[PDB]
């Protein structure tokens, strides 16, 4: 006897909460990268103003 058929299962259009923006791999990369804590925090020339207001024995004793 002939067999009855069924429609192909479709993927529902992905749900994302309003205005949500996922973290890309560039962002996760910055999250797991250790940097030194001691790493310090990251041309016209002007002139400077002015303010207003012996025997051999005494030689050894010399160094000893």
């Amino acid at each position: 006897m002939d067999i009855e058929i069924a429609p192909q299962r479709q993927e529902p259009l992905p749900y994302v909460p309003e205005g949500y923006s996922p973290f890309q791999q560039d962002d996760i990369e910055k999250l797991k990268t250790f940097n030194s804590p001691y790493k310090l925090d990251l041309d016209k020339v002007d002139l400077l103003p002015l303010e207003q207001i012996l025997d051999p024995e005494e030689l050894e004793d010399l160094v000893t």
């Binding site: 797991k32 940097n35 001691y38 005494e58």
Partner: protein
């Protein structure tokens, strides 16, 4: 490095010992010694061991003197120069350069004695005559070159002076003037020369003795130092040496230029003191030759040893002001040569008179001259003059100002190479000033890196000249240059270098040995962090505390910034890993050592506060807050200390969970006092490090703003806060910056907290859709992350989540992952993580055991042990409970009270049997357990359930509270007659509707909120919905519609089936509980149903139907589906005969005849009167318990003609016998004549069924709860032929009716605007064929109608179909969710009646204790009044038979409504359950 020093000390001791023995051998071998002397001079200078430089000079000075005693004067001379050049910045070519060498801290201990040694050699080589003008210059300014040494060898110096007077052929008067001066100034005996001292004075006034030649210039400087000592005595006058005509005519020549032009001096020598004033003033009145005269003037002023005077200093300022005023007027280079000449002699004057601030002026003139002339030559003279000041001034504090000074110098250099050339003048070992502290080295090198080095712009490693090893390590430590040969330096130096950078690729005589411990714990700390581990975190913390931090006053030294930044990082890392015990010990220790660590106390206070809070030491935490809040002010604090003080006050427990108080402070108070803590746009342009710390502050505030909101019934704003926090975190990351470890750790905690909070909020409202999203998002970030404490914490959180949504496979996996993650952290130091671990693995005794070990005698001051009781389900004393955790406490109390009460009742066989009996609430008209006790304990339970606030409950808990509230009312109304019997059932009716209403409500609100709320740095209340839900019921009851509204629910507690009916026409409310346990519970029926559906569904999939081709496999397909179709029929039959037997009449649409019922009620009570033992033997008829009318009616609705009539009637007997029993009417079944009951009732029922008037209700609304949805209720035999539609809540129903003026069935026009989609993916050709004809025929004769066939519809196409149609049908897979997102459908307010034919279009995915979701609810939220769908997957031929008959029977005359049409169309399917039972209807019944 000591065996190195001992080797060279051995050589020096050999030389100095054997040289004196045999002078010939050692002279030729002096090269080996110069090697060793230089070898150690280099080492000791490189390792900053200044103290051993002194002990080397002593052995070196001893070598010099033994060369002199053996008359090797040549070597001795070049040894003096050797010693000097190895231990000074300035260099020497001859002994002349030694004699005029200034005093600095580098030569303080030998310079004078070295000079005396020099004079000894000059004398012994008879070079006095040639050295005469330098030796005269020496003693002329003896106050500068010699008279600075406090331990100056007096007797040796004067004796030298005397011997020079003896051999000199000129200036014999000047050497005697000094000799007499040194004798009286240093108290000494004159008897080192028999002739008297008076005759010695007169013996110098000879013609040949006063002869000075051209060195008559120095005469005045010697006489001054002589006579000023000898005032009022036997003073050799000036008129003894110089005659009158030569002294008097000086004054007279002045009164009438006037300087010796060829000799750079004034015309006259030995100028008087007051006569100089008329010379100085005369010069102030004044092209390029004018500078030449200004030289001659000031040159003479040096030569005249006149003490500092105001008239001189006043002209000094006038001179230099005139110089700077006319720098630009100098064009030629001869005039520039004079400028450098004058500025040179003027600076010499300052050092004589000790005028450091006036020297600074000359430096500025040299600088200005350099810029205007664009002369590097001048700029080098400027830099070197400043460094000369540094050595001479000898101040470490001044050194900070000179670095800023040098910053201006380097920026002015005329090229890149010239810039580096200037820098090396600053970056020089002798700028250390023999400082043996780590603090100064770091302060100097980091300052020189920020202000100077970054101006050099170099990309290769430059080994800066004459700099130490330590200096290079610290300087290049802060650089980012790749290839630095660190392996050349000492390990201690390399260890600082490595800690200063992010790389780790890894002597007793060293400065750093004094800090060996500190240096290596900083290395070990930074090493762990880079590996993302904590293997040594505990050990180095205790080590730093006991072996360094406590030895603070012992070491007695100012703390380096090396140690400061380590503390700030240690406190941070300890905080990040929840080593809260160690954090407390460390922070309290630092606060105790305020004397040295005061500048770091604001950090210690921040992390101490967060420590108490982490261990829930709220008493200590609250004390700390009130102290901090009143001590320090924000208006004057730096942004860093302000950020730290505000960030510590963000925790919820510090505000008693008072949202309005929290909002006042961080919303109004803080921004008014320190606005730049909220400048997330950096309008004030902070340094990138601070800006991120500001962004981090606001993230932490929003995250905490969410916790308070959600614990205050503000779910919407709580969501908005969490979204704001994550949006800032995104903008933070995209800042082009190398994220510091401190801010990375902080952001990791904030970001995970954000995900945790988001999921917890959606768990509370039961949204499984959002929970599933954020869960996967979180689960993705963890994957690549490596931070153990973050990973474990998240895995532990996900495990809890998967338990809630009952995803057992992911539940098992994440438990294993979390367990393995826990090995990667210290269980001894981290109690908060330890307890979580012990909780997950069901080790509760060990959990509370490990708590008392951790705190010990501190356990009284922590809420954590009580907090875990709340987590375990216990309820605690109200007086000891934290006000914030009071809601959880009350809930636990309610469940604990109920468990204890139900337990004590179930041990009495009377109540044990009552919980196992069918119970109704309006049932009657108004050991051995005591009755009044039971009533009392239940009235207390009832009043407690009514006491709790409903906005503090997650939707699943509210569900339990409602079904627990009903059960109490049911049991109580069967035992007695409670106060306000009806109003109690009305509210309890609307109570159970809240858990149905709220999830659907939140879903609608959350999808329609504006997106602009998330990017700017609506709320609902359970109160207003409580009114809405009780008014929705009041409106249904008052509509007087002739319908039945029957709810079907499942009780989690009891496991009972809960039915509730509403009758708007009869104005009657009824409810009954069915103990379900041929026997299967509700979960067992669900497991059997799901098993069938899942098998039938995967037989439907194209994955299977494709691979079947043979005739023999067609049989296997049909045989399996035949079986599944029987498996379900039998399942529905078990449900039909076990759960509802005897109460099916509860669903009967039949309404009884009022005149006949009252007659039956007479006979009914008659039959009970005659056959019931209690009514035959006790009391009188007026004391008999009366049964409610709706129960009596259940008999009349029985059919005697049915086959199992007696089975159903018998169950009703028990139900009535139980109503009477519980109200106190015992009737032993042994004494009941069931024969008579059977016969007499069957007779009276038949007499009714043959005379009854056949009227009935119009429609039945099933309020099917989301847990009962998957059951095909409409296919039970007593519901099969009824007009039925499903509905999710009373509110949803009442809205639908109120919307259409309460007219049933809903009329909907069909003559226009109809939408239809047929075979959108072309996977249903056979289906497409049958309907292709009729659909196109319609749109041909239907205006504004549309059809989409064999074509994937765009989203904005059916979005206007749904909203602008009178009818929308769809034939494909699902409900077309693959063509339109859930968001946009839920954004609609009105949607056309939808016919969602196709697989699983009414199916839902279930997520444990969270609310399930499906496209069926999506349409209802869009405004759809009628949606028809399939509960599971169906096959085409059967469903299209159905669809055809559906359209025909509905008129798509007196056609059928959608309800009747469906029920009358289920029979066309060959598989009447696997396909026929699938379609279902939600909403209002419609008719075309």
């Amino acid at each position: 490095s000591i065996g190195i020093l001992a080797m060279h000390n051995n050589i020096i001791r050999d030389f100095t010992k054997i040289a004196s023995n045999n002078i010939d051998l050692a002279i030729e071998d002096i090269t080996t010694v110069d090697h060793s002397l230089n070898s150690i001079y280099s080492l000791l200078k490189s390792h900053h061991m200044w103290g051993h430089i002194n002990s080397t000079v002593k052995q070196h000075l001893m070598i010099i003197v033994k060369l002199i005693n053996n008359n090797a004067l040549g070597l001795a001379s070049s040894e003096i120069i050797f010693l000097f050049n190895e231990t000074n910045l300035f260099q020497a070519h001859s002994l002349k350069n030694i004699l005029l060498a200034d005093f600095s801290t580098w030569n303080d201990y030998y310079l004078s004695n070295l000079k005396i040694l020099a004079l000894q050699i000059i004398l012994k080589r008879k070079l006095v005559d040639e050295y005469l003008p330098h030796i005269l210059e020496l003693f002329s300014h003896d106050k500068r070159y010699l008279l600075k040494d406090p331990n100056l060898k007096a007797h040796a110096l004067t004796k030298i002076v005397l011997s020079f007077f003896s051999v000199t052929t000129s200036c014999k008067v000047l050497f005697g003037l000094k000799f007499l001066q040194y004798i009286k100034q240093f108290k000494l005996p004159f008897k080192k020369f028999n002739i008297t001292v008076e005759c010695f004075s007169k013996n110098l006034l000879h013609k040949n003795y006063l002869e000075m030649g051209p060195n008559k210039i120095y005469l005045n400087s010697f006489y001054l130092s002589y006579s000023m000592l000898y005032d009022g005595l036997d003073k050799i006058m000036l008129l003894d040496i110089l005659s009158y005509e030569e002294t008097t005519e000086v004054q007279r020549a002045i009164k009438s230029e006037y300087c010796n032009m060829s000799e750079n001096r004034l015309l006259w020598s030995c100028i008087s003191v007051d006569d100089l004033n008329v010379i100085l003033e005369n010069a102030t009145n004044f092209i390029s030759a004018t500078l030449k005269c200004l030289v001659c003037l000031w040159s003479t002023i040096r030569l005249e040893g006149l003490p500092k005077n105001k008239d001189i200093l006043r002209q000094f300022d006038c001179t230099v002001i005139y110089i700077n005023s006319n720098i630009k007027s100098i064009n030629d280079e001869s005039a520039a040569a004079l400028l450098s000449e004058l500025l040179g002699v003027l600076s010499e004057i300052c050092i004589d008179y000790k005028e450091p601030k006036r020297l600074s002026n000359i430096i500025s003139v040299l600088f200005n001259a350099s810029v205007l002339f664009k002369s590097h030559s001048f700029l080098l003279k400027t830099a070197n003059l400043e460094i000369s000041n540094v050595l001479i001034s000898n101040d470490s504090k001044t050194s900070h100002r000179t670095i800023l000074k040098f910053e201006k110098f380097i920026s002015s250099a005329q090229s890149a190479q010239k810039k580096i050339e200037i820098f090396s003048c600053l970056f020089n070992v002798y700028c250390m000033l023999r400082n043996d502290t780590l603090s100064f080295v770091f302060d100097f090198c980091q300052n020189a890196f920020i202000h100077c080095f970054t101006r050099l712009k170099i990309t290769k490693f430059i080994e800066f000249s004459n700099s130490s090893e330590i200096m290079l390590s610290v300087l290049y430590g802060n650089s980012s240059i790749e290839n630095i040969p660190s392996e050349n330096w000492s390990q201690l130096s390399r260890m600082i270098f490595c800690s200063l950078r992010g790389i780790f690729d890894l002597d007793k005589l060293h400065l750093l040995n004094k800090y060996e411990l500190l240096i290596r714990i900083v290395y070990l700390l930074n090493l762990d962090m880079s590996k993302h581990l904590t293997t040594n975190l505990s050990k180095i913390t205790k080590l730093y505390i006991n072996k360094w931090l406590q030895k603070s006053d012992e070491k007695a030294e100012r703390i380096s910034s090396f140690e400061m930044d380590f503390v700030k990082m240690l406190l941070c890392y300890l905080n990040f890993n929840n080593f809260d015990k160690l954090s407390i010990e460390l922070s309290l220790c630092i606060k105790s050592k305020e004397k040295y660590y005061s500048s770091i106390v604001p950090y210690a206070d921040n992390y101490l506060l967060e420590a108490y809070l982490s261990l829930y030491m709220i008493d200590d935490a609250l004390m700390m807050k009130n102290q901090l809040q009143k001590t320090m002010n924000l208006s004057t604090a730096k942004i860093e200390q302000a950020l730290l003080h505000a960030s510590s006050l963000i925790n919820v427990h510090l505000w008693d969970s008072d949202l309005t108080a929290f909002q006042i402070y961080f919303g109004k108070t803080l921004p008014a006092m320190k606005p730049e803590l909220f400048d997330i746009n950096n309008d004030h342009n902070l340094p990138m490090s601070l800006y991120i710390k500001v962004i981090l502050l606001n993230i932490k505030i929003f995250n905490e703003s969410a916790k308070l909101n959600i614990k205050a019934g503000n779910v919407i704003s709580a969501v908005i806060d969490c979204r704001k926090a994550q949006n800032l975190a995104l903008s933070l990351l995209k800042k082009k910056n190398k994220l510091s470890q401190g801010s990375r750790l902080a952001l990791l905690k904030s970001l995970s907290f954000s995900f945790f909070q988001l999921i917890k909020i959606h768990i509370r409202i039961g949204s499984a859709r959002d929970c599933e999203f954020y869960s996967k998002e979180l689960s993705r970030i963890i994957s690549d992350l490596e931070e153990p404490i973050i990973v474990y914490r998240c895995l532990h959180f996900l495990h809890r989540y998967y338990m809630i949504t009952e995803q057992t496979c992911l539940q098992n996996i994440t438990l294993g992952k979390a367990n393995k993650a826990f090995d990667y952290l210290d269980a001894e130091a981290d109690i908060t993580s330890l307890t979580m671990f012990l909780y997950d693995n069901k080790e509760f005794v060990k959990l509370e055991q490990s708590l008392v070990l951790y705190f010990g005698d501190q356990l009284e001051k922590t809420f954590l042990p009580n907090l875990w009781k709340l987590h375990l389900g216990k309820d605690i004393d109200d007086s000891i409970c934290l006000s914030e955790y009071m809601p959880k406490n009350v809930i636990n109390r309610v469940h604990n009270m109920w468990q204890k009460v139900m337990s004590q009742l179930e041990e009495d066989p009377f109540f044990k049997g009552m919980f196992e009996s069918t119970l109704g609430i309006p049932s009657s008209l108004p050991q051995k357990f005591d009755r009044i006790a039971a009533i009392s304990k239940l009235k207390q339970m009832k009043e407690l359930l009514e006491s709790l606030k409903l906005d503090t409950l997650d939707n699943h808990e509210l569900s339990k509270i409602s079904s627990l509230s009903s059960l109490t009312l049911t049991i109580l109304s069967n035992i007695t007659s409670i106060h306000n019997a009806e109003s109690s059932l009305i509210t309890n009716f609307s109570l159970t509707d809240l858990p149905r209403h709220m999830p659907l409500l939140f879903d609608k609100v959350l999808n329609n909120i504006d997106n602009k709320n998330y990017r700017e740095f609506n709320n609902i209340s359970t109160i207003t919905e409580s009114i809405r839900v009780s008014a929705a019921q009041k409106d249904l009851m008052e509509s007087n519609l002739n319908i039945n509204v029957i709810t079907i629910d499942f009780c989690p507690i009891t496991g009972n089936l809960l039915l509730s009916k509403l009758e708007p026409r009869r104005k009657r409310r009824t409810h009954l509980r069915l103990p379900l346990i041929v026997h299967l519970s509700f979960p067992e029926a669900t497991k059997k149903l799901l098993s069938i559906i899942n098998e039938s569904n995967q037989t439907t999939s194209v994955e299977v139907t494709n691979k079947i081709k043979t005739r023999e496999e067609r049989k296997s397909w049909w045989t399996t589906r035949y079986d599944l179709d029987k498996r379900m029929q039998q399942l529905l039959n078990n449900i039909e005969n076990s759960w509802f037997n005897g109460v099916q009449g509860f669903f009967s649409p039949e309404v009884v005849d009022n005149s006949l019922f009252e007659k039956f009620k007479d006979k009914f009570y008659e039959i009970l009167h005659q056959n019931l033992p209690s009514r035959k033997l006790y009391g009188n008829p007026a004391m008999f318990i009366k049964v409610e009318d709706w129960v009596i009616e259940l008999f009349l609705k029985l059919n005697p003609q049915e086959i199992d009539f007696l089975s159903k009637m018998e169950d009703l007997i028990y139900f009535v016998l139980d109503i009477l029993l519980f109200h106190g009417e015992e009737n032993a079944y042994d004494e009941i004549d069931f024969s008579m009951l059977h016969v007499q009732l069957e007779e009276q029922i038949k007499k009714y069924r043959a005379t009854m008037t056949t009227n009935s209700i119009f429609h039945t609304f099933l309020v099917v709860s989301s847990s009962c949805h998957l059951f095909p209720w409409e296919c039970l035999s007593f519901l099969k032929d009824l007009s039925i539609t499903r509905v999710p809540s009373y509110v949803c129903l009442n809205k639908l009716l109120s919307r259409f003026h309460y007219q049933l069935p809903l009329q909907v026009t069909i003559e226009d605007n109809i939408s239809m989609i047929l075979n959108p993916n072309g996977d249903l050709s056979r289906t497409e064929s049958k309907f292709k004809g009729m659909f196109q025929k319609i749109i041909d004769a239907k205006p504004s109608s549309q059809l989409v066939m064999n074509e994937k519809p765009e989203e904005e196409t059916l979005l206007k179909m749904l909203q602008n149609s009178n009818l929308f049908v769809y034939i494909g897979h699902g409900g077309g969710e693959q063509y339109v997102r859930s968001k946009e459908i839920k954004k609609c307010t009105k949607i056309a009646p939808s016919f969602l034919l196709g697989c699983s279009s009414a199916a839902m995915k279930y997520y444990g204790k969270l609310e399930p979701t499906g496209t069926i609810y999506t349409y209802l939220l869009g405004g759809c009044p009628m949606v028809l769908g399939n509960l599971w997957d169906v096959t085409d031929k059967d469903i299209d038979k159905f669809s055809e008959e559906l359209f025909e029977k509905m008129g798509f005359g007196n056609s059928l409504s959608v309800s009747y049409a469906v029920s009358k169309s289920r029979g066309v399917c060959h598989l009447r359950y696997l396909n026929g039972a699938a379609p279902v209807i939600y909403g209002l019944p419609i008719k075309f």
